[PDB]
């Protein structure tokens, strides 16, 4: 199917506690494959998936140099943001970036991304055309003017249409045992009496990859959106994910309820009941 590659940067100032920390993580789909942390004893890009370990020494030297340059660049960006927002040097602030590409089953670029946040709010983002920017406020408009003058969008576009998709295609081939394997959810319903009058039915999905999934409850064939407690999909720690959805139902009425599961590893959506 389709696939994605994303890099995530976090830069965190901490006045009085040294210089700002810089972290990068890289993902293919829901699989972490590389990390960098400026607080590490000897900061380097490090592998986190077996299929990236075969990249040669030149790869690791180049990737590490990119991250080491970024540590310095993002410390400068944090100082600039203080100016743009009229902020004091006493507080702690965060810049985040996410960039990368989505490809279709044929490996062609579906879309590219390069977007940034300051203190958890959108700051500036490359538009889907890969040629123009959306700035969130007058501060980000200053950055936008600079990036328009320097034709940054065109340089991003050359990366996103080239090296981004080429490297993702290589990773998908080298990791085809895992990156190209969906693990379907293992599903079941549990039953938990609350009182004489009510019981909780909980529909479980376990052991699935990738993380995207839909779990719903119906009563008499009608979706129970407002009456369903749905936990965030959560990592198991073995690459797979877990999720549950629960409804409170009157005693004796359990058979009016059905749980419905959709996941890319299932050839057909599943219906379950207590």
């Amino acid at each position: 199917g389709s696939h994605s590659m994303r890099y995530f940067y976090t830069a965190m100032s901490r006045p009085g506690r040294g210089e700002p920390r810089f972290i990068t993580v890289g993902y293919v789909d829901d699989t972490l494959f590389v990390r960098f942390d400026s607080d590490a004893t000897s900061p380097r890009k490090e592998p986190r998936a077996p299929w990236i370990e075969q990249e040669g020494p030149e790869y690791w030297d180049r990737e590490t140099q990119i991250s080491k340059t970024n540590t310095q660049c993002y410390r400068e960006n944090l100082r600039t943001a203080l100016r743009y927002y009229n902020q004091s040097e006493a507080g702690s602030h965060i810049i985040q970036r996410m960039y990368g590409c989505d490809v279709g089953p044929d490996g062609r670029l579906l879309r590219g991304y390069d977007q940034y946040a300051y203190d958890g709010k959108d700051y500036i983002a490359l538009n889907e055309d890969l040629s123009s920017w959306t700035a969130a406020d007058t501060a980000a408009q200053i950055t936008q003017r600079k990036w328009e003058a320097a034709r940054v969008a065109e340089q991003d576009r050359a990366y996103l249409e080239g090296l981004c998709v080429e490297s993702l295609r290589r990773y998908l081939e080298n990791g085809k045992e895992t990156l190209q394997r969906a693990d379907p959810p293992k599903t079941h319903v549990t039953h938990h009496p609350i009182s004489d009058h009510e019981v909780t039915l909980r529909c479980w999905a376990l052991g699935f990859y990738p993380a995207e999934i839909t779990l719903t409850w119906q009563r008499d064939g009608e979706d129970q959106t407002q009456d369903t407690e749905l936990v965030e999909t959560r990592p198991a720690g073995d690459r797979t994910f877990q999720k549950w959805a629960a409804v409170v139902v009157p005693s004796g009425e359990e058979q009016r309820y059905t749980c419905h599961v959709q996941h890319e590893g299932l050839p057909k959506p599943l219906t379950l009941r207590w």
Binding site: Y59, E63, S67, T69, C73, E76, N77, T80, K146, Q155
Partner: peptide
């Protein structure tokens, strides 16, 4: 693989 060009805010 990362993009090796960074652009200042």
């Amino acid at each position: 693989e990362e993009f090796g060009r960074a652009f200042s805010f």
